[PDB]
Amino acid sequence: SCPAACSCSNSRVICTRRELAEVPASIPVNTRYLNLQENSIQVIRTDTFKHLRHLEILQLSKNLVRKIEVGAFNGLPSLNTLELFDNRLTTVPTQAFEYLSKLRELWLRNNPIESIPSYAFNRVPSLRRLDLGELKRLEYISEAAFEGLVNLRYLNLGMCNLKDIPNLTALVRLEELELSGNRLDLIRPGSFQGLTSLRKLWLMHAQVATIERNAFDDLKSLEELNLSHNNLMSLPHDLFTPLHRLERVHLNHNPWHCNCDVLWLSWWLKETVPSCARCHAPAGLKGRYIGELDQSHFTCYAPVIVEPPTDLNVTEGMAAELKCRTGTSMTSVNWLTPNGTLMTHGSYRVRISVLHDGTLNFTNVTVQDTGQYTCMVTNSAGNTTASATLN
Ligand SMILES: *[C@@H]1O[C@H](CO)[C@@H](O)[C@H](O)[C@H]1NC(C)=O
Ligand SMILES: [Zn+2]
C-alpha cells in the first residue's frame, strides 16, 4: 500500500519535492530505497521506522532536521547508507544509531554541528565512508572521537575551519582523507602517525604555512597528495623521498622560495614527475618552473649546526636534552645513538624523541643510555655532523 504524496516502485519509495513537516506513517514493509529530500521535516522520533527490515538506503537530507531521538533507527538490520546532509543539526546523535553493524555510509555534511564527542560513532563500527563536510560551525573535536571505526576507508573533514588535525590514529584502515578548506597552520608527523593504508590526502586551501621534518614518512602507501593553494614557502629536505608510491602531487599556488632548499624538490619533481609549481621568489627566478632549475644559479654548501650538542652529566630520573639547531630549518636531521640506532622527527618511539627543533628529547632517562650521540644533518649540498656524549 503506497502512501499519498509519494511514488512507489516494485521496493523504492520517492516522496521528494513536497512540503512534508513529518515522516508519513503508511510506509510499505518491503522497501530498500527511501528518498525524503527537499522537504521541511524538523524532528525524527523514536521507532519512526517500523518493520523496515529490508531498508538499505534511507535519505533524510535537505530538510530542517533539528532533532534525532534515542533509537530512531531501531529495527533496521539492513541499513547500508544514511544521508542527513543540508539539515540543521547542532550535534551528532550518538544514541540514535543503536547497534548497526550493517551501516557502511553516513553523510552528515553541511550541518551547524558544534562538536564531535568522545566515542561518537562507536555504535556504528562497520562504517566505510563518513562525510563530515562543510561543518562551518564546528568548534571542537574529541581526541577519542573516532574510536571504533576500524573499518573506515573514507573520511571528509573539509570546509570545517580546523585549526589542528584531529586525532586519526584510531583509523588504521583509512584510505582517503579530505582536509581541504581548513586553517591547518602547520602539519606534524604525529598528525598522520598510524595511517599506513592511506592512499589519498587532500590539503588544498588549508592555509598551510609549514610542513615539519618527516611529517609524512609514516604514510608509506600515499599516491595522491594535494597541497595546492596554500602558504608554503619551502619543504623540508627529502620530505617525499621515502614515499615510493607517490604519483600525483599538486604544489601550485604556493609562494615558493627558490633558494638552495628547493633543489631536492626540483630534483624530485624532475625525477618523479607526477604528470607546474613556479618560483615566486626571489625576483631573479620569479615565474620559473621549479622542476626545470639547474644547480648553476645557486651557491650551496653543507648544513651549519648553529647550536651543536654539548656534553651532559645527568641524574637517573630527571629530564635530558642534546641540542641540534641548524641553518636552515628545512635541513634534514638524523640522530645516532650509542646503540647504532638511527632516529628522526618522524619516529614514533616513546620517551626518547627528536623534536621539530632537531633537538633530541628525553623523559625518565636511565644511566644505561650513557654513550656518544651524534647529530647527522643533510641538505642539497652535503652532510655535516656534530657529536657529544651524555652520562
Ligand atoms: C661528567 O663526568 C665525567 C666523568 O664521569 C667528566 O669527564 C666530566 O667533566 C663531567 N662533566 C661535568 C662538567 O660535570
Ligand atoms: Zn605557483
UniProtKB/Swiss-Prot annotation:
Positions glycosylated per UniProt: 167, 226, 313, 339, 361, 364, 383, 391
Domain LRRCT: 254-302
Keywords tagged on the record: Cell membrane, Cell projection, Disulfide bond, Glycoprotein, Immunoglobulin domain, Leucine-rich repeat, Membrane, Phosphoprotein, Repeat, Signal, Synapse, Transmembrane, Transmembrane helix
Protein origin, superkingdom: Eukaryota
Domain Ig-like C2-type: 303-391
GO function term, MF aspect, one: signaling receptor binding
LRR repeats: 30-51, 54-75, 78-99, 102-123, 126-148, 151-172, 173-194, 197-218, 221-242
Membrane topology of the entry: Single-pass membrane protein
Subcellular location: Membrane; Presynaptic cell membrane
GO biological process: positive regulation of synapse assembly; regulation of postsynaptic density assembly; regulation of presynapse assembly; synaptic membrane adhesion
Transmembrane keyword on record: yes
Disulfide bonds: 324-375
Claim: Coiled coil is one of the keywords in the record: no
Domain LRRNT intervals: 1-29
Gene Ontology CC annotation, any one: cerebellar mossy fiber
Post-translational modification: N-glycosylated. O-glycosylated; contains sialic acid.
Subunit structure: Interacts with PTPRF. Interacts with DLG4.
Role: Synaptic adhesion protein. Regulates the formation of excitatory synapses. The trans-synaptic adhesion between LRRC4B and PTPRF regulates the formation of excitatory synapses in a bidirectional manner.
Domain-related comment: The extreme C-terminus binds to the first 2 PDZ domains of DLG4.
Full protein name: Leucine-rich repeat-containing protein 4B
Included range, full protein: 58 to 454 of 709
